[PDB]
Design a protein around this ligand. Structure first.
Ligand SMILES: NC(=O)c1ccc[n+]([C@@H]2O[C@H](COP(=O)([O-])OP(=O)(O)OC[C@H]3O[C@@H](n4cnc5c(N)ncnc54)[C@H](OP(=O)(O)O)[C@@H]3O)[C@@H](O)[C@H]2O)c1
Ligand SMILES: NC(=O)c1ccc[n+]([C@@H]2O[C@H](COP(=O)([O-])OP(=O)(O)OC[C@H]3O[C@@H](n4cnc5c(N)ncnc54)[C@H](OP(=O)(O)O)[C@@H]3O)[C@@H](O)[C@H]2O)c1
Ligand code: NA
Ligand code: NA
Lengths: 325, 324
């Protein structure tokens, strides 16, 4: 099995804590041969965790070095577009973190570069690879609750001053639509779309409740899927509480968690998996083994972002999600 | 002295909800007159009361000189005309919710109320439920900090065995949104009592059950004038568990008939009959000069208006005041 020579770009939290451990479990598929960051010492610390990749002062040099088949971008979202374009111009595949971009108009440019290039652009939306969501999808699609009627997802993150993501520069002064609403919201849209399909319209109210979190941090919404199912999605990044994620149909109900699905009275444990690992496997198959790009698809990520961007601008008015696309 | 009260409409609410309450308030109410669409139902109800006078028609009961006030437990389409007839004879009216079939018609009830010296009390019993009062005081006293988000999810799960489902004026509803306004006005009342007036709603209404006349599912988002966001979702046909939660900057309450949970801590709510409480209030209004804060038609119109807005919405933003 030939390996994908991979360059890591942006050696921050995701790269160290989320990407590397997954990558370390996939060394039969990937070799990290190059590394670059804004702060050189950060790239050097990352190099040591990896082994001995070449360290570059700039991404453009990494791209031209001949050392890589693809690059992994774990950057401030403002950088996705120009950096994806640089990679494709050099004939290099890209796996890039969500959100696809800072907003939908910029996102669309990522999509068109993707569609015009022969190289793969893969937006790493790990919620598309979470088994609990797949299992919910299967239950729903096979008629286990009858016709889906209503879903509610309430999320209370309770981030405080000790949360590491809160202190990063590009989150404190967000350039992305809705601040934390897009940052974490694309995950939630990904999941709802996986389980129930495309959303037709939303109506939502977004608030900025914490001076600690850059931009908006509270969102409450109703929407309707194209299939007629009604959704409620409410989240506070700053306040505490218990997640509920429930789908009620004509014949019964499911509740969804990381570790289990409950179908009426019946518990089913979901065997645990690393979704980052799962997405890297999928990217490998897209790049090397000619698998279609369904789950890392730029178009999919753009649709995730569109849901959130619609909510941010709704101010309680009905927004048809298509009109953003 | 005691309020001479005539019962009009001897159906479910009259036998099962109203009479027991009055039987505990025999020192404040005497039932003297009774009338219904079916004379035999009125005669059965009379036998349950003692020996009141049975009348073939509302109009006759009103001219009989036997009552100071009437209690209307009727198809909602009849509220406006029956209230008007009573006020035009010098007779107080206690009338069941909803105030009317729709806001346009409701306003006519409000208008007649303000012009008469007699009381019109819309018996919205949810304004008399102690669980909501204790929740109000906790929120008002700053127990959870600034209120951020309330969520009320109701799954009534009505079936063929529920008696309300077989009543004619519910099967072919004339009232806005069918069951949505029938049960919804209660919920608006509780929401308004706890968090105050609502600025705007956005809502979707479905008709999911062939058994329930009219629309029977509703999901909505809205914002109180104080800034709190609300979600209110109800199905009248499907089963699930009620949650009623209000989250603030400092804490969390969860509300139930018998208890309020403040963060980790439970406080039992002492139980009461809300019908019994509302009749006492009506007694205090007509005999004791108590201002009509809790049974006032204006409050009942605002309840209906919340629900009417939600039915018109189709997902669009509706500013409630625009209906009033
Ligand atoms: N899927 C998920 O569960 C998830 C979770 C968290 C984050 N993410 C995504 O991962 C990406 C990074 O997030 P993060 O939390 O890791 O934030 P972060 O810690 O701030 O990481 C960003 C990294 O990029 C570096 N960088 C900034 N500008 C650069 C430039 N011009 N050229 C090269 N490197 C540059 C930063 O600078 P320094 O060199 O100075 O350190 C830092 O190393 C984001 O797109 C985010 O949405 C995804
Ligand atoms: N606050 C609450 O918790 C609550 C609960 C239930 C009901 N309610 C309200 O109370 C009212 C009564 O509802 P319900 O459940 O008791 O329904 P119901 O059983 O159908 O009661 C209506 C009664 O009025 C009679 N009636 C119909 N037209 C009449 C007319 N023209 N003249 C005299 N009587 C007439 C009916 O027919 P017959 O004489 O042939 O029997 C029946 O006895 C409704 O407005 C409802 O919204 C409130
Ligand atoms: Na904020
Ligand atoms: Na129905």
């Amino acid at each position: 099995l030939r390996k994908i020579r991979l360059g890591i770009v942006g050696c921050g939290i995701a790269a160290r804590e989320l990407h590397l451990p997954a990558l370390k479990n996939l060394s039969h598929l990937f070799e990290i041969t190059a590394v670059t960051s804004r702060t050189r010492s950060h790239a050097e610390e990352f190099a040591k965790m990896v082994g001995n990749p070449a360290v570059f002062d700039s991404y453009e040099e990494l791209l031209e070095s001949g050392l890589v088949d693809a690059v992994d971008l774990t950057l401030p979202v403002e950088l996705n577009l120009p950096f994806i374009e640089k990679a494709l111009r050099k004939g290099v595949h890209v796996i890039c973190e969500k959100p696809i971009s800072t907003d939908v108009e910029t996102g669309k440019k990522v999509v068109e570069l993707s569609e015009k290039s022969e190289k793969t652009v893969y937006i790493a939306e790990n919620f598309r690879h979470v088994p609990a969501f797949w299992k919910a999808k299967e239950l729903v699609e096979s008629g286990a609750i009858g016709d889906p009627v209503f879903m509610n997802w309430q999320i209370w993150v309770g981030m405080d001053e000790n949360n590491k993501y809160v202190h990063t520069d590009w989150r404190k002064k967000p350039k992305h639509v809705g601040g934390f609403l897009s940052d974490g919201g694309v995950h939630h849209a990904a999941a709802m779309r996986l389980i129930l399909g495309e959303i037709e319209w939303i109506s939502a109210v977004a608030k900025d409740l914490s001076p600690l979190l850059g931009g908006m941090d509270f969102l409450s919404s109703i929407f309707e899927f194209e299939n007629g199912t009604v959704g409620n999605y409410t989240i506070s990044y700053s306040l505490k509480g218990n997640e509920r994620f429930e789908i009620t149909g004509t014949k019964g109900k499911i509740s969804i968690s990381w570790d289990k699905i409950v179908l009426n009275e019946e518990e089913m444990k979901v065997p645990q998996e690393n979704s980052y690992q799962k997405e890297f496997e999928d990217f490998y198959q897209v790049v090397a083994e000619g698998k279609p790009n369904d789950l890392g698809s730029p178009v999919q990520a753009l649709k995730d972002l569109a849901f959130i961007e619609a909510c941010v601008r709704s101010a309680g008015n009905k927004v048809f999600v298509s009109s953003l696309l």
